[PDB]
């Protein structure tokens, strides 16, 4: 894909959101900002630039499915890449979130490894 695609890396753990910048990098992707939950996230996003959203699901105010939600609902950011980062392969999430048009899923906790081929087949099938 592209290498400086702007990526917003949603997360309540800062740890966790320290890891996403992390992994991203190792794999060439350093056009990155953060949001600490969805509020945030959509206060960012309005603004611009952004090519790619990586979202947890347990975030206050604003949690990750809503996030989805909004960007999905919105007819400017309509068509915007949203990973979603779900804790287990809990079929019911899996489940609302490609429903709820996210873009793809991985399990946390993922390597740079499967972040890499969860990000190139969405590429891949975006037209990325």
Known sequence: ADKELKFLVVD?????????RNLLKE??????EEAED???????LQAGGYGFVISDWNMPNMDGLELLKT????????????????AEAKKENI??????????????????????????????????
């Open 71 to 86: 960007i999905r609902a919105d007819g400017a950011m309509s068509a915007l890449p949203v990973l979603m980062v779900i």
């Open 95 to 128: 489940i609302a979130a490609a429903q709820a048009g996210a873009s793809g899923w991985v399990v946390k906790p993922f390597t740079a490894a499967t972040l890499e081929e969860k990000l190139n087949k969405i590429f891949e099938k975006l037209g990325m």
């Open 38 to 44: 969805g509020v945030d996230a959509l206060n960012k």
């Open 12 to 20: 309540d753990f800062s740890t966790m959101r320290r890891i996403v």
């Open 27 to 32: 794999l060439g992707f350093n056009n990155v």
